[PDB]
């Protein structure tokens, strides 16, 4: 995010996906993601264990550390 000078509310869309539902699947939503992420492939070594927690909605997804956050994934 070089030369920052804007605050979009698109990220929400990410959370909107999780938020729309029950936060019950917040940090547990990303965790599962890492499952795929980690997988060497393009990142041989990693800390699936650490990267998991550490991760971070983005941050952005939403903007509430009071709910939870973790590493997500895409198709």
């Amino acid at each position: 995010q070089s030369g920052p000078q804007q605050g979009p509310w698109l990220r929400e869309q990410c959370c909107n996906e999780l938020y729309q539902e029950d936060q019950v699947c917040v940090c547990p939503t990303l965790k599962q993601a890492a499952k795929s992420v980690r997988v060497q492939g393009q990142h041989g070594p990693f800390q699936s264990t650490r990267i998991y927690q550490i991760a971070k909605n983005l941050p952005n997804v939403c903007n509430m550390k009071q709910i939870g956050t973790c590493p997500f994934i895409a198709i």
Partner: protein, 31 residues
Amino acid sequence: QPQKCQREFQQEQHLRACQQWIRQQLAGSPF
């Protein structure tokens, strides 16, 4: 170990906007 959770996750369509961090996040080791 909620199935709906894991389900909804994939069942839906793993977000993309996250694909950024989610992916980029991998980084973490400057040469």
